[PDB]
Design a binder for this molecule. Structure first.
Ligand SMILES: O=C(NC1CCCCC1)[C@H]([C@@H]1CCCCO1)n1c(-c2ccc(Cl)cc2)nc2cc(F)c(Cl)cc21
Lengths: 10, 232
């Protein structure tokens, strides 16, 4: 989902 | 002896400040309030566009918070979802109280009162903004209060509250020390800031009622808002 992506990215 | 933060506290505050000050085009919101069309649709669009950009900003700020990556991944999502509403209101209160051009306050209020928000919720919103304004908060105070709101171990369900308390306590300690450094003639300043965090919590119920009203009146939200605000 969107929040997990934004949290775990880079 | 002296009144200063220790080197480790100065460093921790520096990265909170570098992260908080990461604001792409801060003139944008100011110009939207002043120049856009004055219709219920345009006012609602400013809110969803600004709230969406804010969620992106909030996640980037949150993931860089000292010790946030040591947290269990379910508790990380729960802290972000549980604090999003309060962070939005605190951030709005910051912009509300900034040195802005003549008429900005009047035009912003004209917009807020034409956004499909009931009068019942506009009154505590303006009251909170004014109470924030009276405190004459520094950027350090807004940044640390935001970090404290995100790292709250006592608002929403968290599996390991002690782990969250341990990350919040040094932030609260840096904040209290800054009040002693920058507002030495007002010993009750820190307690006033904590008073504002108590007031911030009332917006969880207010926002839940505003959302229900918007959904009834067939208002559309972006996928990122639907997720963080748990829209169905
Ligand atoms: O876009 C807004 N806020 C963003 C949110 C992300 C962080 C930056 C600020 C809204 C918009 C402005 C146009 C009319 C409708 O409200 N807004 C709210 C507000 C309205 C309802 C809710 Cl539920 C929450 C906040 N209070 C504000 C105070 C302000 F000074 C300014 Cl400039 C705008 C403010």
């Amino acid at each position: 989902q969107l929040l997990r992506y934004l949290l775990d990215k880079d | 002896s002296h009144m200063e933060l220790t080197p480790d506290q100065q460093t921790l505050l520096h990265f909170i400040m570098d992260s908080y000050n990461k604001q792409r085009m801060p003139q944008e919101i100011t110009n939207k309030i002043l120049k856009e069309a004055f219709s219920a649709e345009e006012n609602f669009l400013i809110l969803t566009e600004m709230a969406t950009n804010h969620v992106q900003v909030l996640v980037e700020f949150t993931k860089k918070l000292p010790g946030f990556q040591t947290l269990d991944h379910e508790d990380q999502i729960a802290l972000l979802k549980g604090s999003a509403v309060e962070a939005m209101f605190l951030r709005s209160a910051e912009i509300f109280n900034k040195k802005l051009p003549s008429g900005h306050s009047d035009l912003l209020e004209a917009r807020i009162r034409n956004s499909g928000i009931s009068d019942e919720y506009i009154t505590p919103m303006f009251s909170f903004y004014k109470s924030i304004g009276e405190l004459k908060m520094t950027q350090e105070e807004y940044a640390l209060l935001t970090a404290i709101v995100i790292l709250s171990p006592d608002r929403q369900y968290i599996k390991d509250r002690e782990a969250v308390e341990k990350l919040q306590e040094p932030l609260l300690d840096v904040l209290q020390k800054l009040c002693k450094i920058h507002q030495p003639e007002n010993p009750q300043h820190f307690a006033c800031l904590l008073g504002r965090l108590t007031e911030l919590r009332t917006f969880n119920h207010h926002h839940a009622e505003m959302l229900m009203s918007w959904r009834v009146n067939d208002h559309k939200f972006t996928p990122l808002l639907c997720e963080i605000w748990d829209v169905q």
